[PDB]
Amino acid sequence: MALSTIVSQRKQIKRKAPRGFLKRVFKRKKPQLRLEKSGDLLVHLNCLLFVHRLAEESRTNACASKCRVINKEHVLAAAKVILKKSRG
Amino acid sequence: QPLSKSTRDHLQTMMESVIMTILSNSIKEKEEIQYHLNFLKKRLLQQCETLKVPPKKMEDLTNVSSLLNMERARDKANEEGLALLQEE
Amino acid sequence: RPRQDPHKAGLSHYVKLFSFYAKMPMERKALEMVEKCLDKYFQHLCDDLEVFAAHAGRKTVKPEDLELLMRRQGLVTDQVSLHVLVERHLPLEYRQLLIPCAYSGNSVFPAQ
Amino acid sequence: NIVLPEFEKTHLEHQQRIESKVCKAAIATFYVNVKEQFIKMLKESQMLTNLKRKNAKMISDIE
Amino acid sequence: SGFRKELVSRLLHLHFKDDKTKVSGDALQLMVELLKVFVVEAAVRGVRQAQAEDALRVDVDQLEKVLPQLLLDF
Amino acid sequence: EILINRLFDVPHDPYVKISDSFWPPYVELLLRNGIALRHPEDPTRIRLEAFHQ
Amino acid sequence: MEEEAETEEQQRFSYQQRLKAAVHYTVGCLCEEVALDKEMQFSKQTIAAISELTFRQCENFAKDLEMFARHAKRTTINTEDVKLLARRSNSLLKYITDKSEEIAQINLERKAQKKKKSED
Amino acid sequence: RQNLQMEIKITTVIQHVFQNLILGSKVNWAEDPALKEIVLQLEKNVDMM
DNA sequence: CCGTTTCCAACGAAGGCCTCAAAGCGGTCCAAATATCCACT
DNA sequence: AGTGGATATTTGGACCGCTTTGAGGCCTTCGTTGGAAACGG
User: Which keywords annotate this record (chain G)?
Assistant: First the structure.
């Protein structure tokens, strides 16, 4: 397999969430606010749902645009709608 | 042999549309005039149901003008081609 | 002698989750794209949480703000609440902390 | 072609019942509207069939 | 040549979850102008799509080409 | 007892709609301990796990 | 009992039809005043479609407004909920905020006139 | 025979329900022998009695 | 007696499956930072 | 919560058979096309 192409992961990594990374990001972005006890878990869940939406959209865009391998324009066009739908 | 229900639903949506547009300008005596309109519309539907007519055939009404234009273009093209061939 | 910044180390988890959910071979040029989209999404999420907390009248972020945001996103509704999504997508160690449960003489944890 | 006359006189089957001004105006307006629609759609149908058969004959002639 | 107050008042009251929730005057004033901005935006989007085609008139097709992203924005 | 009765009497439709009497603590306990299962289409209906099968 | 319920349902349906006709007249006026000075012509099907879609979107607007009002423990809707509802795209957000500034200076004018009348 | 089958099924269901309840209640059963006998007799089969 | 609609014979490519060879590296074993964490004070 | 000490983690090093892609063959089966024949004037 070429280094440019990555095969799909047959096994999923452990479902442990990087709570420290999310806390550090939320602190460096908005340091004036304070997150609650387990808000990072809800942020992780929202990120999981966003990634799932983006993945399915990129998959259908790549399979509908005469392609067996996900390219850059496919995920680009998927993000251009997913990012707009994810805000409210 | 009664007609097919395609022209029936076409007529019913056309009559709903014309009732709606004539009601758009109506200001006084709102509810009873539209009540009478739907009553007489259902009565005309019944009268069309009881009527009999020899069978005929055509397609949906949304593609009338487009098909007419395509047939006009094809007629002109065939005419000019036949004229050229005959002159030769 | 490898060197990895915490940002890429944090984003690699979601990148691998995306690669697993795609179920299709993906070019390497899409990884940085997914990372940039994740950064933009995190920025917009932080801004939305900030404005929601400001409108709520308090300085701290509470789970009702995230519930309102997910409801505006179309993910959470009155029938399909947040507990259903937590049970569907999260393991037991997080469900024990998020969803309240009673045991041992009506002892409820967390207090809800 | 045969359904059109009958429906036509249904016009005067309504005039004998309703008597209000604006109701009568709406009746006349929407009735002439649906009549125009009937005539135009049937004329378009006839012209479409004739044009189709003429196109078939003409392509046969050129071939 | 715009929306009326009673129109949108009925529209919002008949679609609410409970009639106990009331609408103030400034909110009702902003609602009609928001609806007007939305409809004029839809119209100008459709006509700009038609100009991208430079067709003869605006019909259902140019509308539905831009229709989804409009409500995706709103 | 209600869940067991619904499972044993109606074999092909053992789902029960969640009521106000079923407060979230006990329902969550039963769902976490694997005793009960939500309906795949609507979480408002729950059933008992078929242990004998 | 069912007959009276069905008559009330039909009365609500006639009310909805009147609202549809009114909003259709309004959107027709708007579209036919923008089309002429935007050098293009419109078809009636597009007018009907925009009418129906505006009617359907008003319900979503009402839902979002009631949600925003409930989130702040307020049974009445104010300008803050209408400003939050427009936060999806910043362009119309700024448009609505400057419109609220206009409403605010109008309220200032009304308050000044009321104080002047009370002075007399 | 049908009564035997029904009793076996009911007993299996009750056994599994009791086991899951004792597990989820988060109680120490080894200290109380009266419950220890039950939790030791729960797992064994019913038809081979 | 002759033109037209229709079923039948036939070439084809078309797709679907099978096989082999070549370039790649993921997986397994292994180093020594180093970073997650749990409570240290 | 700043300070701390410890132990599992992993990423770059190294190597072989599993891995997929590209190409060639070849087959069994539907379809478009030409034509003989029955029907209408």
Answer: Acetylation, Cell cycle, Cell division, Centromere, Chromosome, DNA damage, DNA repair, DNA-binding, Kinetochore, Mitosis, Nucleus
